[PDB]
Amino acid sequence: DKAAPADYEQFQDVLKVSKLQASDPEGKSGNKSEYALNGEFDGLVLDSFYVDKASEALVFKMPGYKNASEVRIYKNFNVGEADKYYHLGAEIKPINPRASVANTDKAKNDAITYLQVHNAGSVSADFPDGVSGEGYIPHPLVRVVYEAERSGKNDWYWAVIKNNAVNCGSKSGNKGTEECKNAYLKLPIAPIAKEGTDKFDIYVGGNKLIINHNDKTAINHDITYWNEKKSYFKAGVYNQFKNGESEAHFYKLTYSVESEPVIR
Ligand SMILES: O=C(O)[C@H]1O[C@@H](O[C@H]2[C@H](O)[C@H](O)[C@H](O)O[C@@H]2C(=O)O)[C@@H](O)[C@@H](O)[C@@H]1O
Secondary structure, X not given: OEEOHHHOHHHHHHXXXXXXXXXXXXXXXXXXXXXXXXXXXXXXXXXXXXXXXXXXXXXXXXXXXXXXXXXXXXXXXXXXXOOOEEEEEEEEEEOOHHHHHOOOOOOOOEEEEEEEEXXXXXXXXXXXXXXXXXXXXXXXXXEXXXXXXXXXXXXXXXXXXXXXXXXXXXXXXXXXXXXXXXXXXXXXXXXXXXXXXXXXXXXXXXXXXXXXXXXXXXXXXXXXXXXXXXXEEEEEEEEEEOOOEEEEEEEEEEEEEEOOOOOO
């Protein structure tokens, strides 16, 4: 039933420019495993990363709080260039995500992240693609998440946007500040599909973050405050809930560099 994603033409392009980071839910190493660090995914099939032969879905699957199975796209890109927009396209079906979160500990821990724009560190700093370095702050620019319930909305996708470039980590000395208390916009994108897939396109460039869902722009947000941070894409599952396992089927996942975003 399970095959190597590298065998499937529709995923080959994105995999050539990615590595896989995958937690080991019962491993005792305490740091995630990493694979295809050279962008070569031949032979890679795991419980947490495979193609389902029948549907040809790329499956990311992961038990346990804060664990993840995700590809990390190589390019550390600048978000402030005119006419250069970095684009992550995905067509996904989350698999019974309400079941995944059903045994969680508290209402806030009821989320699953599918797509991210994270920072690698400063545009000022000389470190290569594919890794992180000086200037890194421990917050992604945006996560597209499923949330079971928020603000009366049940089973919607949300964009969790970091709305400043401040380090608000536990060792920052900043957690009490206004910037840190008010650091995020959490904005509702669309309910999860009743049937079929949900199509996402993220464009980052020209000092903008654009997020489309089913070809309709849901987020169109100036990100000039982030433009000192080299940024990069991740896609898969990453768990903000306890005591279960998440699963997402990606029927398409693409990465490209465009002269302009699609705004509609
Ligand atoms: O749950 C929280 O205390 C805050 O989480 C923040 O998102 C975290 C996220 O859960 C992962 O740890 C992540 O990738 O790092 C994130 C970050 O932005 O630092 C935000 O959701 C924040 O609103 C929460 O209060």
